[PDB]
Amino acid sequence: EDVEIKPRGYQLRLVDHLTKSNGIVYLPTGSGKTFVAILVLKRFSQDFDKPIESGGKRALFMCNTVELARQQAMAVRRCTNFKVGFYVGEQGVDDWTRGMWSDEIKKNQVLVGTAQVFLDMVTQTYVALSSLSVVIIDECHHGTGHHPFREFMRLFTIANQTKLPRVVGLTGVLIKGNEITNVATKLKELEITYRGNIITVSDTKEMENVMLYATKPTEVMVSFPHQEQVLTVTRLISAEIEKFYVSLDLMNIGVQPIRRSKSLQCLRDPSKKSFVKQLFNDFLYQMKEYGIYAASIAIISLIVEFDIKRRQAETLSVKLMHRTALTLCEKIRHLLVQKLQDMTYDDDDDNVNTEEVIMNFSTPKVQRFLMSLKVSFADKDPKDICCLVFVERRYTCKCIYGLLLNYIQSTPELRNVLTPQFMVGRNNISPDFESVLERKWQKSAIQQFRDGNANLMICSSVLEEGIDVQACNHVFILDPVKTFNMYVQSKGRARTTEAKFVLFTADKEREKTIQQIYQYRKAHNDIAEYLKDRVLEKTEPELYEIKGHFQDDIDPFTNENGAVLLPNNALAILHRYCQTIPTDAFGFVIPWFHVLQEDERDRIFGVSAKGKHVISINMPVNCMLRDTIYSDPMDNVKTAKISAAFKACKVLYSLGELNERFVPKTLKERVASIADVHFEHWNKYGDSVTATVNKADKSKDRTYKTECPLEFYDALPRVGEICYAYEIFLEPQFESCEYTEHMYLNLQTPRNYAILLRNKLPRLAEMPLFSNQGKLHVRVANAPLEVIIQNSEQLELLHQFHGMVFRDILKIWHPFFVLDRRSKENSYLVVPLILGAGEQKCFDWELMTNFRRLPQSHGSNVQQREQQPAPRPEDFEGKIVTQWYANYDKPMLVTKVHRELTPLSYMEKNQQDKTYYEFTMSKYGNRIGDVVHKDKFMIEVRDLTEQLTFYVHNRGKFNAKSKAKMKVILIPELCFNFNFPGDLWLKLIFLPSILNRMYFLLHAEALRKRFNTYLNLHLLPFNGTDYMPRPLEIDYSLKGKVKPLLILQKTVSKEHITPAEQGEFLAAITASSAADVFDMERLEILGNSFLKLSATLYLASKYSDWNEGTLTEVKSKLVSNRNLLFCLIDADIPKTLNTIQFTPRYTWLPPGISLPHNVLALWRENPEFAKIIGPHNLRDLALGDEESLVKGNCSDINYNRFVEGCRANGQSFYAGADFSSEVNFCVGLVTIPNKVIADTLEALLGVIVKNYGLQHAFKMLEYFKICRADIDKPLTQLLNLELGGKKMRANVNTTEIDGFLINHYYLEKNLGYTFKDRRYLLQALTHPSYPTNRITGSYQELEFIGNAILDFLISAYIFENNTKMNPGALTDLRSALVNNTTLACICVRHRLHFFILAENAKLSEIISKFVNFQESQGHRVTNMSTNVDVPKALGDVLEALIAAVYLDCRDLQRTWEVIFNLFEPELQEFTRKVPINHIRQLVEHKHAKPVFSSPIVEGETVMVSCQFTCMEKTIKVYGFGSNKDQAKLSAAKHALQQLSK
Amino acid sequence: IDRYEQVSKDFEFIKI
RNA sequence: GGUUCGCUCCCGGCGCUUCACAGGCGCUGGAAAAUCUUAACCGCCGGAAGUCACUUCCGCUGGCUUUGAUUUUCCAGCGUCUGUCGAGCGGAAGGAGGGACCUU
């Protein structure tokens, strides 16, 4: 504070004496014993800054109360340079560890707090007595019996008897109560208790005269006549209260914990009935003692207290009890005001009328009180007056406060001088008079008195001790003085000069009161007599007396490490431990004490217990103390209970329930019961749920080994084996335009090719291919051609033709490729077909025999052409030719032949003035020296495209290609003619795309068969299956009555189940990165929605004992993409995924072509070469013809060339990395993103949903071991799955469902659904703030299931209806539909909010404001002015109501009907146009940049500011709201409004 | 029995 | 059929930044309630003991003061988990089109 803190003479001599030895300072209140305590603390601060372990010490300041502890904390903090520690129970030190105490100890130089907290701190070995320097105990006179001060003093006895901290007690009174006889013995007892010597005034000259500033008051007495007569209304009210008591005793409320007498020999009424009985007894006391008007205020107090209790009642019966009490109080109030008005009818002067009714219906005691105030104050300035009024009862304070308010308002002489206020101790009562939340306030009543706002204070004995008040000039005592200490402290409160002390008594009580006062005076003087007469001794060194005084109590126990359990703390410890044990909502866990009878004492014990009492402890089955424990024989039942509790605590510590520090243990974890079983498969892949998976975003991609389907494996034909050839049909869907004439003509030629396999292919759906000329419908024949390879040379011809196709025709060949027949992956061939015996097509043996290799395009000079024969006119149609003189050597097809045309051609628009003959001489005369067959042969030729990836849909557009393309007429003798049929070449052009599509089509067929076999789905459409043509994904972005949802309809009815199409499985397998015309991204949304719903229902059914928090905690891991990735890897599916975008010439491998077998062998067999073979080392290899054809093993040069990379990358520090870049095709490695695998699993789930309903997809989840089975039943049906119990349903009986639901009929009609089990509805409507939440759950758990169900149903509806919308817009629509704001809008639109069972001011006001705004808006969703706040509770209530509607009927169809009848206008409007979120809309604006902010709350209205741009000028708008989200939304809406302008 | 009888308003603050 | 543009646009995925929606959790403050419990003092009524309602002891019960603990609820701020998804930016690849053309 300031340096002006200079002690008095008495303070300095007191601290000087105190440094020498322990003692107690006895000075009147206001003498600054706090100041001398501060000086003592300062004098002992030599070691405060030093650490404890090195020898540093701290000081203790104990206070009897938390409030006084806080006051002393502020005092010591302001008067010292130390940092003070304020430790009380309410601070939360109940579970602080050793470190959490040590840091506080080392950071604080002096410690303050309540006695119990420091007692626990010392006894739990957080500190030791030797670690303390000086101990301060204010109001030490409370240290009697089993007070915590005396326990702390016994801690000195048990601790080391030397090297002990100093102790001082601060007090202004020593005698507690009426022990005013033989005060010397009590003073000696206080001395030995605190092992010190009391010090007080010794020099009458200096100490007394300096203390004189704390003046003694002038003691005055005011008398009133005794009242013998009681009014008639008094007897009427008494009779009514008596009959109400009779009714209450007859009333049968629910069973309550058994309450019994203090010595437990008699039973007592339950606490709740005891409370109303206590309140009515107190009201009767006020009524009898203080008059009718006082009773008229006390009845208001009873009204508000009973209203609060009814508002917080936990049961219908308790509500009925409090309602009966409330109406009886209302009747009493009516009678009281009636009785007042009978006299107020006398005259019209309303102020004088109120004064005279107060005068006439008051008791003479309060009458005298009012006259005394009137004569004492008499229009004095309010700044001068500060007075306290003391009354006994708590409610008397409030009653006198109200009556004095009314009297002041009725007295013009007293109207402005007095500003009354009332204060009650820890047993607080409601200060309001009207209703709940009369006004929010920040200053306490004592602080209002301190600041001068209030000048008259009415208080109980709470203000008597410790609390700092100004020196009051007047003190009044209303009820007679009961204790000596109360009198002394009340007279001490009147501290200022010439202060007035007034006490009230009856006329017949004057002599007894004066006798008691004179006895108090005699005792007060005897205190000084003892102090001035006692002989000087150092520190009361009679240690034998200390031991004899402390030995009466039971000897405490000390365990290992030095912790100590005092016997008087045993009951508290036992009850604290019994609080921890689990139990039902009603079952009492407190120990059931039982006093043993006379015949039991001498049976359990000997005959010694004939007189002394013995008590036994009986404990419920939930706790460990199953064996009964009998107390030691003690002379009183209180000590017997203490001993029994001490022995029980000792037994519990022996059992290990109490820890080393005698505090019960705690729970560890709850959700691990599921992490033990559901997430087992994580471990084998090097992951676990307990570890930090998201460290640096670990491994978002993984490497997988691709595997060809069962049909493509080991399908290579051999000699003599039966073989199957499937003809491939290409049917062009485009028109026969000039641009497309050759394409259309040559695609439908019967010279189709076929694929050779030893295995039998299943039927395959017609599939699309997109060429430049249009789209193709490629289909594979369902019936193969039976062929037998009778000779080995036939097989060799097939193999050489197969290699020649990919090598020369399609130019897929790379130098390091090897043709092989021993590799079994994709071991199959494609052969050409030709018409044989009619429809019996046969292998084109003539073609393969001639075309073992495509002949080289080579030149021929003029003379060589003359030596060669002329080119036959009929040998060119439909044949492939190439320009051997031009730079481009690409092949090109003959589309038209000419004999009328001639190298001496007719001149054209660009060939003007020249024939084509002379044109070739002009252009390339270096090659074309002359033309030898100038006469009669000509051809028209079309180029063929180099494109192989025919999956791109948009490449086939005709708008640009509508423009004419010039012909290319060519002289025949100058171009080499390939005898290969051009129509077969045009079909071979599409071959790689068809092959790659058939690959994954067979994979999808295998998956279809697997998932059909698991479900036992072998019905009619799965053996004679004929697949629909595979459709385009049009949403891929490349170009009254309720209709039942089809998914649920096929879930319930078998007739609507459709076969799981092969194309759908192919789509579910093909990732979006594959660049195809389809993917899984649409199936993923439905799969994810179903997975969410199924996981929610499964967890809520199996684990009903859990809350929504733990259920969500488990579900977030169960449906996580990591879990789905591991789950799908468990199914060995990721080896069949299509993610590669199929670049043939750079990343593909022909089916008949493999790499050198040494590479494959060392890749597979070497862990160092598992994935780390060099890319460019393998891609730089080159092998000879026969080396690549049959040799297999590469040359040593190339072998070492790639083995050097193998060694340098695998057998080095690069181990664990992947070097398979562009050499993925060698062993079939591929890198697939984790989210792709997770979405594959979700898409498979979605396909099975869409095709087979919900139960079959739940069985699929069981197959994927996502839903782990159980021992009783593996897993039940998803529908009719058993979920419910105490947490999803109200446990109340049918007699109170109508008590809680006042008008359930008009919610039943409004919602459109009729409940047969109202218990679900009751919990759905129950907000968590409702009082019954503590016993019968709330809507919070049911809202989880409701959200899952509503989300899945909405997603399924928008999925099945809006078939052309991509997943992004689909989830935007879903988010707009299931937003909390729109859920609240629908809730208010149906007026469901009226039925919410909630009690909360700031929730109800928000609900009312929002519903008023929505009514003003006319139920139109703004997708607002002055920052309207959305009551988030409404959406949760609607979700829980949906869940209740589902659980009542256990049918998703009825639930969907209800949801649709609620959402119909919302669904229509949002399907017409999706309302993107306002923040999203502002951010996505291409011209405006939101740039928001994260400012402060500056009170309730937390502020957010936005920074956007509008027509090139910057603007700054401000958002306000209750929370950050609402303020940001309002700012975004304002920015949108400005942007619109 | 209708009301409290109103005491003599003149009284003295008696010293202890 | 092909080349080319510093040309226009588009799809998907990777890397960085960031937002929205749904289900949550943790930490820190503010507010409210329920239950249990500790200690001390005084009084009413009853019983007992020394001199036997004088003093004391025991019990009932009421009043005041009071300690510690558990649980529930609401609000705000800061982090964070899961699912759906958008936006901005480096960059690669693919496609469409509009120019420059290139064959015959």
Ligand SMILES: Nc1ncnc2c1ncn2[C@@H]1O[C@H](COP(=O)(O)OP(=O)(O)O)[C@@H](O)[C@H]1O
């Ligand atoms: N020597 C002194 N120097 C400074 N202030 C003093 C001195 N003596 C008394 N005071 C003031 O008088 C007040 C005494 O009140 P308090 O200490 O609460 O009285 P008590 O301790 O007797 O209840 C303190 O607030 C203190 O500031």
Ligand SMILES: [Mg+2]
């Ligand atoms: Mg003080």
Ligand SMILES: [Mg+2]
């Ligand atoms: Mg997706």
Ligand SMILES: [Mg+2]
């Ligand atoms: Mg997904």
Ligand SMILES: [Mg+2]
């Ligand atoms: Mg919730």
Ligand SMILES: [Mg+2]
């Ligand atoms: Mg919700």
